[PDB]
């Protein structure tokens, strides 16, 4: 997350990291047994940490639970990164505390100007890198599908949203892809890609989360 600040310990519940000897990915808890992240984002073998603050120090309220099925959305197109969404079913279910919650999944798409929260463990610098070890959040409005389009002429899916500052220096960055965005209290974005990160015209662009509710709920009933 570049441009934002540390949030506080544990207000991000739902924000998992996914570690495959370290952090490289985020996700959001969506059931005690089901994480959701970006198919750009899988590996065989994941491990979910749950209640961090500081991914680089044991405080107590976390929960590793690795991944017992790892299922890609049947349309994600490694290339346009269309359809970049996944849900990972833990081998048993996370408690649920003040530190560790879920997110609902949406009702409707957020209007454009909707503000929404994002996080992650990304890098911190629009030049250069510093990955930090305390989970940043950025306060971020939904931007319009015309604008969205404008940034980026012919590569905007209708599953996909703009989520940020035209002007530069706010954004999500390498290491958030995966997690989070949450606004009124609905997980409706999932960080997924963008033109280096903070650029000017060049916002984040997520995967659109509530195209996908029938298929999450499927895959969960089904599995
Ligand atoms: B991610 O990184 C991809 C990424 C995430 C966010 C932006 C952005 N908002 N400008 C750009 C690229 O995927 C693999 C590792 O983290
Ligand atoms: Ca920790």
């Given at each position: 997350?570049?441009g934002?600040?540390?949030?506080?310990?544990?207000?991000?519940?739902?924000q998992?990291?996914?570690?495959?000897?370290?952090?490289?990915?985020?996700?959001?808890?969506?059931?005690s047994?089901?994480?959701?992240?970006?198919?750009?984002?899988?590996?065989?073998?994941?491990?979910?940490?749950?209640?961090?603050?500081?991914?680089?120090?044991?405080?107590?309220?976390?929960?590793?639970?690795?991944?017992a099925?790892?299922?890609?959305?049947?349309?994600?197109?490694?290339?346009?990164?269309?359809?970049?969404?996944?849900?990972?079913?833990?081998?048993?279910?996370?408690?649920?505390?003040?530190?560790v919650?879920?997110?609902?999944?949406?009702?409707?798409?957020?209007?454009a100007?909707?503000?929404?929260?994002?996080?992650?463990?990304?890098?911190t610098?629009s030049?250069?890198?510093?990955?930090?070890?305390?989970?940043?959040?950025?306060?971020?409005?939904?931007?319009?599908?015309?604008?969205?389009?404008?940034?980026?002429?012919?590569?905007?899916?209708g599953?996909?949203?703009?989520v940020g500052?035209?002007?530069?220096?706010?954004?999500?960055?390498?290491?958030?892809?995966?997690?989070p965005?949450?606004?009124?209290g609905?997980?409706?974005?999932?960080?997924?890609?963008?033109?280096?990160?903070?650029?000017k015209?060049?916002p984040?662009?997520?995967?659109?989360?509530?195209?996908?509710?029938?298929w999450?709920?499927?895959?969960?009933?089904?599995?």
């Amino acid at each position: 997350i570049v441009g934002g600040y540390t949030c506080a310990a544990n207000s991000i519940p739902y924000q998992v990291s996914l570690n495959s000897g370290s952090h490289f990915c985020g996700g959001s808890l969506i059931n005690s047994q089901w994480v959701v992240s970006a198919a750009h984002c899988y590996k065989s073998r994941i491990q979910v940490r749950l209640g961090e603050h500081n991914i680089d120090v044991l405080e107590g309220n976390e929960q590793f639970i690795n991944a017992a099925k790892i299922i890609t959305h049947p349309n994600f197109n490694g290339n346009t990164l269309d359809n970049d969404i996944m849900l990972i079913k833990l081998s048993s279910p996370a408690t649920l505390n003040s530190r560790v919650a879920t997110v609902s999944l949406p009702r409707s798409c957020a209007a454009a100007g909707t503000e929404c929260l994002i996080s992650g463990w990304g890098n911190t610098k629009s030049s250069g890198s510093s990955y930090p070890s305390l989970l940043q959040c950025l306060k971020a409005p939904v931007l319009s599908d015309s604008s969205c389009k404008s940034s980026y002429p012919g590569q905007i899916t209708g599953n996909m949203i703009c989520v940020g500052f035209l002007e530069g220096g706010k954004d999500s960055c390498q290491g958030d892809s995966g997690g989070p965005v949450v606004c009124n209290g609905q997980l409706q974005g999932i960080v997924s890609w963008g033109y280096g990160c903070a650029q000017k015209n060049k916002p984040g662009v997520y995967t659109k989360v509530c195209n996908y509710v029938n298929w999450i709920q499927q895959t969960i009933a089904a599995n």
